[PDB]
Amino acid sequence: MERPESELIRQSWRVVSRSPLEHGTVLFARLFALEPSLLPLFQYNGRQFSSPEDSLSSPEFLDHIRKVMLVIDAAVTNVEDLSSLEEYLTSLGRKHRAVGVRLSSWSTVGESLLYMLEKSLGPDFTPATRTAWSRLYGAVVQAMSRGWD
Ligand code: HEM
Numbered sequence: 001m002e003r004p005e006s007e008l009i010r011q012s013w014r015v016v017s018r019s020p021l022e023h024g025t026v027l028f029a030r031l032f033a034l035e036p037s038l039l040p041l042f043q044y045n046g047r048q049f050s051s052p053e054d055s056l057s058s059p060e061f062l063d064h065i066r067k068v069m070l071v072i073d074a075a076v077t078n079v080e081d082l083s084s085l086e087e088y089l090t091s092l093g094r095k096h097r098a099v100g101v102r103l104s105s106w107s108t109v110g111e112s113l114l115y116m117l118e119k120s121l122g123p124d125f126t127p128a129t130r131t132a133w134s135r136l137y138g139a140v141v142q143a144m145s146r147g148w149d
Pocket residue numbers: 038041042043064067068071072092095096099101102103104105106107109140141
């Protein structure tokens with residue numbers, strides 16, 4: 001990730017980072033709207049969520065969203081030199097393994113992240129901004145993939 005894209009990522013993330021659960025709530029609502037077959041992957045207290053709105057009522061799931069947003073925040077923090085996060089990201093890929101699932105739906109999660117950013121930023125979601133985030137997301141998924149394999 002080069003310099004120009006890096007300030008773009010930082011600037012755009014500031015808004016998000018002020019209310020991470022409200023934003024991650026959009027990401028996951030979008031995710032389950034696009035691919036409801038991912039809903040059963042998130043099971044707490046020996047229960048499957050029936051509908052996407054059920055997931056938003058689960059404190060365990062909302063806490064999961066906060067973890068996701070904290071990891072994206074760590075990626076933003078290290079956007080200039082990710083290799084600093086490489087080991088952690090490989091360990092995160094290992095975690096998915098695993099608990100049970102592949103990362104074959106990585107693009108859908110990526111499009112849900114970009115959806116949340118588009119909706120939050122509005123006119124500030126420039127072509128340059130989208131491209132920067134797509135590349136950052138791609139870099140994170142690659143490190144996680146090294147994890148998993
Ligand atoms: C490729 C599609 C993905 C799927 C289907 C998926 C699904 C899941 C599932 C089922 C869990 C376990 C939930 C639980 O039992 O609480 C999980 C954990 C997690 N995921 Fe994802 N995930 C994907 C990609 C990602 C990406 C791209 C990131 C971040 C950039 C991410 C960050 C996390 C974090 C931080 C956890 C918690 C890890 C821990 O407890 O140590 N995931 N994911």
